[PDB]
Design a protein around this ligand. Structure first.
Ligand SMILES: [Cl-]
Ligand SMILES: [Cl-]
Ligand SMILES: [Cl-]
Lengths: 392, 396
């Protein structure tokens, strides 16, 4: 019962999308909280003397995949399978597909893709395409562009007459209610889930997004067809621009993301005042609080980092270090969202956040001690004033 | 609105427990998953010429505490407050109590306790007691025994003619059906939630549990009255041996805890085989799996560590390092449940830039017996069999 889409999306070339909307999944990569779900998109190109399958579905949906595929083509007539990326969320249906096809097919992948298909599935008959290589298949020119580390070294994109099959590149979370970018309302709601996808999945490799976009700018792109989320037929440059904007960490003016843990309320009281001072100074804080009642999603925290003007952390000391969920959060921010942005740290003295961040691009403006009873609130207002002046 | 208990639990001396069952908290210390909730237990000792309050309730429950306390005594007749531990889950109600008392009392605490009461609450006039010090209050001898780092430096226990008011020491999660250790089924249910409490709260300082237990070995204890969970009037030594058992990590024969992350199911396939092999060699596996559908509570994983004979880890590789949730789990295990036990590691061979899983446990007290590679198709079943055989050889 997940929703399945199968639609013809171009007449010439004759191209179908096969999309399943995973509303079963709760954690992408087994960690990122995605209550909004994610889709898996595969494509079929039907030509004279060729039927080209591009990517696939997650392995637990392999049966639904063959059933949906069978409605648009007899799998026995498939001659080529292009694998832009071998991660099983896109490639999990491949062994079932190859068995269903029941005879040899040409399988096309990057150099690293072939090694992964071999390791994962025992697949041996893989044709390796190199960067810029062109193949004539069913009378049409397929061009293959290596875009490595987006987010694995096997990642490539397939170019067909202006149509880019890009798998992860251009992906996003969320199950949109149409296939494509033909509705503004849908596009605007979708984009933050693209942001969430970029950071959680590709964030460590964001510099490769800039190189990737640069490599692709040489090509005339009419449409972008990714392996997840919306297809872009009307304005592919808008999706690419967004990828770049997230990668660079272009800030929204006024946006400050505040993240803290609060066990007894001593941190909460300092934080509540910091947040008020932010508002009172014209800022729009987005607040993530770890407490004995509430637990934010790390995927949501990460999603909010790239377009923040600045970050604020409130940190309890805990034993020899700091609070475990703050350690975890800082470590993920450093790994996936390492941006050159200003930070305030507020902390309780124990019996540190600094050394974690000190090999990052983040620059701590000041540290402020969170005290209990003798807490001088003047030093809160002072830290916020310092931030505002930095941002002027 | 929480279940409150109010009950005389001793006639001589006259002692009341005030216990509230916190069914609102979801995470203790804002991290430990506790759907079973936790209680806060304060006590009142009524003496000739004295009324001694011992510890209190969490801050968000101050009003409920006051009204509760008021039914067993007029607060203005309170002469002494003993603060065994200053953490706000037990001390939060104190300022509202002082306010209601309305006149000066003797507030008793450890050296560190006094400094913290000032830091948290601005409370300044506190009587410091030292290790083994006795004060005569209301015709009775109160003895104070410092039990440091259980789990803070301020921690002490109060000894009153064989009755031990121990706050966190001897505490547990869970909101038991009754007050004391009078029902075996209840005791048996409750004890794993004590282990859960020990590891999550005190596990980092488990060596001080041993120091503390034997420090109290010279005291005739007929009752142990903690600040969380069950009271022990029938067999306090049973609870004490449990604390000691968890701290030493005494193993339940045959018990193995298997912890893995399965990003796509290749780890899962291998781990399922390992778990089958464990079973036919007579082990009873406890299994924790991070997948795209399910996510175990870290507090549950930690609780199962002390009496495990061995651990088995199944590890995905993720960029430079390891899986975030497995990193977190490993770091909390090292921090809270660092035991000298044998470990099997199963890991995917990644293309990470050349810290490793086995590098993390390398400094710790766990002993890695072997590493086995998780391969996709072409995985040799034989390799899993010999890892489990090697484990059974170690454990007998
Ligand atoms: Cl706090
Ligand atoms: Cl962590
Ligand atoms: Cl896996």
């Amino acid at each position: 019962m997940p929703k399945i889409w199968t639609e013809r999306i171009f007449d010439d070339p004759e191209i179908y999308v096969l999309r399943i909307d995973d509303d079963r999944i709760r954690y992408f990569e087994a960690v990122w909280e995605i209550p909004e779900g994610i889709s898996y998109n595969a494509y079929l190109v039907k030509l004279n003397g060729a039927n080209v399958l591009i990517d696939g579905w997650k392995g637990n949906y392999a049966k639904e995949f063959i059933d949906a595929l069978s409605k648009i083509v007899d799998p026995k007539e498939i001659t080529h399978i292009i694998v832009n990326h071998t991660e099983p969320d896109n490639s999990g249906s491949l062994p079932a597909t190859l068995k269903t096809i029941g005879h040899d097919v040409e399988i096309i992948a990057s150099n690293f893709g072939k090694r992964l298909l071999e390791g994962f599935y025992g697949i041996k008959d893989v044709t390796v395409v190199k960067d810029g290589e062109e193949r004539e298949i069913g009378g049409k020119k397929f061009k293959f562009v290596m875009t490595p580390w987006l987010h694995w070294p096997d990642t490539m994109v397939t170019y067909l007459d202006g149509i880019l099959f890009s798998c992860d590149v251009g992906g996003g979370y969320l199950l949109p209610e149409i296939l494509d970018d033909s509705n503004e309302s849908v596009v605007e709601r979708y984009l933050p889930h693209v942001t969430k996808y970029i950071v959680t999945v590709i964030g460590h490799y964001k510099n490769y997004i800039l190189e990737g976009a640069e490599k692709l700018s040489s090509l005339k792109i009419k449409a972008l067809l990714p392996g997840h989320g919306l297809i872009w037929k009307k304005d592919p440059q808008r999706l690419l621009n967004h990828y770049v904007s997230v990668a660079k960490g272009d800030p929204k003016k006024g946006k400050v993301t505040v993240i803290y843990d609060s066990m007894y309320g001593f941190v909460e009281n300092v934080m509540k005042k910091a947040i008020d001072s932010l508002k009172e100074k014209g800022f729009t804080p987005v607040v993530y609080k770890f407490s004995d009642e509430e637990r934010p999603a790390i995927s949501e925290i990460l999603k909010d980092i790239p377009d923040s003007e600045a970050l604020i952390f409130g940190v309890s000391t805990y034993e020899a270090e700091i609070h475990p969920l703050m350690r975890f959060t800082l470590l993920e921010i450093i790994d996936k969202a390492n941006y050159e942005k200003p930070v305030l740290v507020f902390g309780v003295h124990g019996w540190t956040a600094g050394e974690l961040l000190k090999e990052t691009k983040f620059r701590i403006l000041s540290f402020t001690e969170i005290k209990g009873s003798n807490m001088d609130e003047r030093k809160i207002e002072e830290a916020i004033s310092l931030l505002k002046k930095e941002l002027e």
